[PDB]
Design a protein around this ligand. Structure first.
Ligand SMILES: *Cc1cccc(-c2cccc(C*)c2)c1
Length: 14
């Protein structure tokens, strides 16, 4: 994946 999940993952490095 969702818009949040994708950004959250990006912010973490996943
Ligand atoms: C595509 C996806 C599915 C589940 C969880 C995540 C995710 C979200 C935040 C951080 C990380 C490392 C992974 C992504």
């Amino acid at each position: 994946x969702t818009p949040r999940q994708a950004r959250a993952a990006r912010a973490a490095x996943c």
